[PDB]
Amino acid sequence: QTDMSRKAFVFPKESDTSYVSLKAPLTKPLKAFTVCLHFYTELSSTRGYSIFSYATKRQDNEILIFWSKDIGYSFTVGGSEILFEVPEVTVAPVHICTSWESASGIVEFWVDGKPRVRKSLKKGYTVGAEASIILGQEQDSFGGNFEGSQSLVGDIGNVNMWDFVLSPDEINTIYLGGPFSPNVLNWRALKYEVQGEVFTKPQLWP
Amino acid sequence: QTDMSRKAFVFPKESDTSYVSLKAPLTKPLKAFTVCLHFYTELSSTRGYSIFSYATKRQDNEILIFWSKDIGYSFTVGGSEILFEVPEVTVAPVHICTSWESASGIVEFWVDGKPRVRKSLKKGYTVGAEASIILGQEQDSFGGNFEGSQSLVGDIGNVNMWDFVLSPDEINTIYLGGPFSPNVLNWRALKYEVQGEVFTKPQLWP
Amino acid sequence: QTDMSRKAFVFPKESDTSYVSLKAPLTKPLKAFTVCLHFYTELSSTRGYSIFSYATKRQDNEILIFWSKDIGYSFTVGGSEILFEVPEVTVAPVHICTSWESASGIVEFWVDGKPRVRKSLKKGYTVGAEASIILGQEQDSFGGNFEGSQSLVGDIGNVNMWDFVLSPDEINTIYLGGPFSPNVLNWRALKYEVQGEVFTKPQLWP
Amino acid sequence: QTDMSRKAFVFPKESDTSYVSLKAPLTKPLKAFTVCLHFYTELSSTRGYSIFSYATKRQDNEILIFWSKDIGYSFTVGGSEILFEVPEVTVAPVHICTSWESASGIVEFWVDGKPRVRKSLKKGYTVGAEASIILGQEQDSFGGNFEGSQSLVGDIGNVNMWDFVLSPDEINTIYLGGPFSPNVLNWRALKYEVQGEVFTKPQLWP
Amino acid sequence: QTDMSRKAFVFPKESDTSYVSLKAPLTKPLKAFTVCLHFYTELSSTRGYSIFSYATKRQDNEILIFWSKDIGYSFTVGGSEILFEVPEVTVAPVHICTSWESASGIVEFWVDGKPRVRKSLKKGYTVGAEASIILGQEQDSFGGNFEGSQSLVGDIGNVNMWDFVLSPDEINTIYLGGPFSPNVLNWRALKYEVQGEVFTKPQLWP
Ligand SMILES: C[N+](C)(C)CCOP(=O)(O)O
Ligand SMILES: C[N+](C)(C)CCOP(=O)(O)O
Ligand SMILES: C[N+](C)(C)CCOP(=O)(O)O
Ligand SMILES: C[N+](C)(C)CCOP(=O)(O)O
Ligand SMILES: C[N+](C)(C)CCOP(=O)(O)O
Ligand SMILES: [Ca+2]
Ligand SMILES: [Ca+2]
Ligand SMILES: [Ca+2]
Ligand SMILES: [Ca+2]
Ligand SMILES: [Ca+2]
Ligand SMILES: [Ca+2]
Ligand SMILES: [Ca+2]
Ligand SMILES: [Ca+2]
Ligand SMILES: [Ca+2]
Ligand SMILES: [Ca+2]
């Protein structure tokens, strides 16, 4: 386990080879999850990019968080998609927490600790446990077929994942930096492999 | 019996079918009232929607608070309508209180604790006590004929109603959240029943 | 005498008949005066209205503070006018103070405690003491012939008047609502008569 | 000598006859100087005006601070001139300090305690002390040839002048109203001759 | 050497002759650096200018920080350039810190203590120690061939340089004016040569 606390991955070039792959010894399929992360990039006015990409052998977009140019955050689970529109994008590091629940299909999207409206997606689905998690790229297969025009450029960090929906009060503790214990994927204890041109640096965000 | 403190109803998809019916003990006709409720929806740019629909067997729009696209809050009692202009709208949860008084016809409308100018409406009218209070839908008959295009999407909560006009000091306490106790419809002691795609979830607003 | 503290007059309808008449104990003519008041109205985008009309047998516009559509605050003394043009207006309660001094003709106009530039009006004039003071209407006879399109809609209150020019420091404490004592017209010791649709209600402002 | 503290001159109408003449005790030519003042006017919407004027038998614009419409502050020494352009202006009192040094020609212009870029002007020149200082008018002969379209309207005060360049730290104590002691022209011990319709009134700026 | 603290160099007119040379005590080639500085100029809307020019006998733009009109900051190493574009610019002093690392090519740019996204430049390059460092001008030969169009006008100071990439925390204390000690170029201990119309004055920025 590597403690990545206060560190961030830097993807400083547009490329299809640069990525990191994050391990998840997860034994059971996800009836719900939350994923939170920090990212920073100036691509938001140039083009879309993959922020977080979870894939399984049956489904290359099993969870994906994706900025889509001139729209906002695409959030898609099980290959079906919703949009959270962002009409005035800004150049700053941004903290997103997203969460999804099978029992109701409710999606929550939180940006910088402010909630977006709850939306419905994939009620009754179940996210596969045998999955490849990739940062820095969008993957179109179980572990590859990355597209250079979908790569992230800039920084990502504080990637945390839970197998349950965090309440609003928990998400405030995340954003404000209280203590917490992610039970699927944990930045304090991350297991990962780095590929290509990717660096670990001090985080820019406070 | 249910105490909904810190919980909100979620209507996560547009339909003609998802709604909740709220029950009131009142049998004395309302010579005045206040209703306060907190809600969050992104429909405000796309289309109109019904925030709070109060029908009586005589009259489908006995009280209604409604958002009209590019107009602002429509408010109506006894089927007669006034408009509160909202020249620009922002995506965030919004708390409104509205109160009406037959003896003067004055309507007050309050948005996030800031008052709109008082207006006259239906002086001398009297709202019927036999009531079908419905959230999430607009009703065009007593408890039915919902127009799906008028449905709410998103969250509603803290629905409280009083048989009298709250003073400005009380209304500030409602918004900032101090102690109070309504006598027509109390969120902390809410008789309700639920139909269709409706969920009770932790409230997104502090 | 009525202490109108915390209370305001509400004019909830257009009419040529809703008004209040304020009685001044005023024997000697005014070589100088100050008037301060709160009002709140949505007419500002739509048409002009009379904030404060002071009339005499010789002159129906002996003092008049008047909003002029797409122009701003007209202030007239003795029927001569100057304009404090406002480039754009916002819907919130407004506090104004106006002072005038015959011995110099200098007018000061204050809005929310911010001074507008001093101007000259009717140097050496003398305002009559035997006056009809009307709130809610503009008058063109001594006490009547109101014009409906000039009537106020919404609220007025904290109407105070002094037979001398307040300094900048006093006018600040008027806006802050500190200790002061008017001597021509006092909201805590008001003598008035109400005609038509007018109501006394809690004030909508701090 | 008169202590004008807390007081300001008021020019309440446009004319070419109202002005006030300030007497400097100075006898030795100025190789450097600073002047600071508060003024307030609405004319910036409409026309240029002479804020501070200094003239000599040989030169009518020996120092002149002048608002040039659609441009900003003109500053001129010895009849040559530079602009500190101002793209956005607002109706409020404004405090300016300007300072000049023959040994470099560097001008500093400070507006509301926030500095403008240093610009060179009349390097090596020398300013005549046998001078008439005028507020309210531009000045085209030693004491006269005023131009009505260049008169100031509104208020002027805190006129202070030093025969040396104040440091940046000193100028902050001016703007924040701390202690200082001018030696060419001192608002706390002023000599002046008021002429025409000019009034001394309590200042509007804090 | 001189302690220049609280003082800045003023370049008050455009020329191809006014410049200062800073004598780095530098002997071993730089595999990384940080340079921080304050500058203030109104040229940013009119034309580009050289903020900090480092050259070696082989290479006239060995490190160059430059403003490109309607583009933003150009940062170049070894003659290769990246843009940190700026869509809106304001007339105020600006503090920049910039860093580069040979081992990765990661460039950081910090404007007023806000980080720009990290970008890749000149991986594996090395920066020569035998160098001419010049402010006020761009240099196209080792110590000369200045272009008037590329001269700085206005003020520059607090120039500090390190032979290593400062962390985000260390860069914050620089912006906040906490204690630090540069090891390549130090404003507390500057060695420099001055040519032409350049002056040392008290700094305008806080
Ligand atoms: C989310 N998205 C559809 C915009 C892009 C990803 O889809 P795909 O390229 O992986 O097929
Ligand atoms: C308020 N409204 C008139 C815009 C919509 C509701 O009217 P209705 O559809 O119930 O007849
Ligand atoms: C509108 N006005 C204040 C300029 C003039 C009003 O004159 P009048 O309508 O009272 O006769
Ligand atoms: C143009 N100016 C306003 C800076 C100077 C005017 O000098 P003058 O010709 O009006 O006396
Ligand atoms: C402006 N620039 C920094 C991109 C290039 C400058 O080239 P040069 O003028 O130093 O030769
Ligand atoms: Ca894919
Ligand atoms: Ca893809
Ligand atoms: Ca209806
Ligand atoms: Ca309907
Ligand atoms: Ca009249
Ligand atoms: Ca009239
Ligand atoms: Ca002149
Ligand atoms: Ca002239
Ligand atoms: Ca060069
Ligand atoms: Ca060059």
Numbering used by the authors:
A (entry chain F), B (entry chain J), C (entry chain I), D (entry chain H), E (entry chain G): 1 to 206
Direct quotes from the study:
C-reactive protein (CRP) is a pentameric protein of 115 kDa composed of five identical non-covalently associated pentraxin domains. The B-face binds to a range of ligands, with the canonical example being phosphocholine (PCh) head groups in lipids such as phosphatidylcholine. This is a calcium-dependent interaction, with each CRP monomer chelating two adjacent Ca2+ ions. The A-face modulates many effector functions of CRP, such as activation of the classical complement pathway, where binding of complement component C1q to CRP is mediated via predominantly electrostatic interactions between the Ca2+-containing globular head domain of C1q (gC1q) and the A-face of CRP.
Decameric CRP is formed from the offset stacking of two pentamers via their A-faces. Intermolecular contacts between monomers within CRP decamers were also dominated by non-covalent ionic bonds, which formed a second ionic zipper, perpendicular to that found in CRP pentamers. Ionic bonds included Asp163(chain A)–Arg188(J), Glu170(A)–Arg6(J), Arg188(E)–Asp163(F), Arg188(B)–Asp169(H) and Asn172(C)–Ser181(G). Although decamers appeared to adopt C2 symmetry, they were solved without symmetry applied and reached resolutions of 3.3 – 2.8 Å. In all maps of pentameric and decameric CRP, clear density was present for two Ca2+ ions, and in conditions including PCh density for the ligand was visible and adopted similar conformations between the cryoEM derived models and those found in crystal structures. In contrast, there was a slight increase in the prevalence of pentamers at pH 7.5 when in the presence of PCh. The addition of PCh amplified this difference, with pH 5 containing 93.3% decamers vs 40% at pH 7.5. No major differences were observed between the decamers at different pHs, with or without PCh, other than the proportions of decamers to pentamers.
